[PDB]
């Protein structure tokens, strides 16, 4: 029953290791860029005017 290891040593394991990985900095200061560029259009960080708010 070499299927428990095959899918876990040559299908999934051998494929997950062969993935291009970037340094964490370019993802941290990419989520940061996304949240900074979308601060004006986020109506929970900056509450909308009462008239604009439908609730």
């Amino acid at each position: 029953a070499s299927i428990a290891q095959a899918r876990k040593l040559v299908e999934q394991l051998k494929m997950e290791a062969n993935i291009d990985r970037i340094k964490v900095s370019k993802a941290a200061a990419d989520l940061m860029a996304y949240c900074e560029a979308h601060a004006k259009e986020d109506p929970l960080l900056t509450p909308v005017p009462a008239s604009e708010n439908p609730f």
């Binding site: 040593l9 990985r21 929970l44």
Partner: protein, 341 residues
Amino acid sequence: LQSELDQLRQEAEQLKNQIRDARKACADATLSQITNNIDPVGRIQMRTRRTLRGHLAKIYAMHWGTDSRLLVSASQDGKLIIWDSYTTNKVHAIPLRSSWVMTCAYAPSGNYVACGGLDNICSIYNLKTREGNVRVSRELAGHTGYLSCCRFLDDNQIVTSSGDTTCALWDIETGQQTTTFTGHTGDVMSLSLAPDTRLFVSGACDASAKLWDVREGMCRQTFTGHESDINAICFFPNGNAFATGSDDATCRLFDLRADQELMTYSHDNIICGITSVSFSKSGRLLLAGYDDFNCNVWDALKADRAGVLAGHDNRVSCLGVTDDGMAVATGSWDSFLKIWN
């Protein structure tokens, strides 16, 4: 289990010490080193603006409509209700064949709603019909475990996650089986389709989540950073990250390109587990529904609590932000839906 298990068990581990070494090599920062100088979002407060009462039994799921107005609530009373958040009106009340339902979803077009529970079947309902009522469109059977999360890809294909360690995608028109995503070693609890709808992530009860290729069919990567079951998952708005809500009193987030864990979002005083998570509109606020009848609001960049959403006398099981990020639709076991700000 032959000589290829005194060999191919180590060779099933050689790619684990040569992956963590690869993983721990591309880490020149943590999240709280480039997000340190950004001023905090402050003591974010949010009062309830609409309390959608009407359910009797405990609420288990709640999905927002694409139009930012309608929402569907799933409760253990065997009833599915489509709401009008602006006026708290009840658009529909769809009885369910199985009184035990743990999933609910809204089709992106708004023409369909799906539900599923211990019956191990996803029943998909047609909302707009010439008949004038709500009737089942398909009876998606062929899955052994109880369903735990249903999400609508298009108007004709749906993705479901069940307790038989298999995430799995259907085609509504045929009702048959297109792709079966396998590899999890425990009951899958949550699901979160990517904004581009070409990938999705799912968290099982094995302290691990897998990013699947819905078009291709195999798991791209597995994310192991917890120590207990993952009963909550949600996807970053930008499509390059996601957060895991686990029952070990912590909620971590991961980056798809980094293939690592970024922050933990844990407090010493909090012991109860997390049930649901969601990013609001830009990923700065990470809403998280906990088990002690509360729902903390986390500044994702700073990993500090910005506010609490108390007001439920029973544990919070549902949590979802609207499409335009104008309100939240937390629902708890007290059979009460609530809309915040």
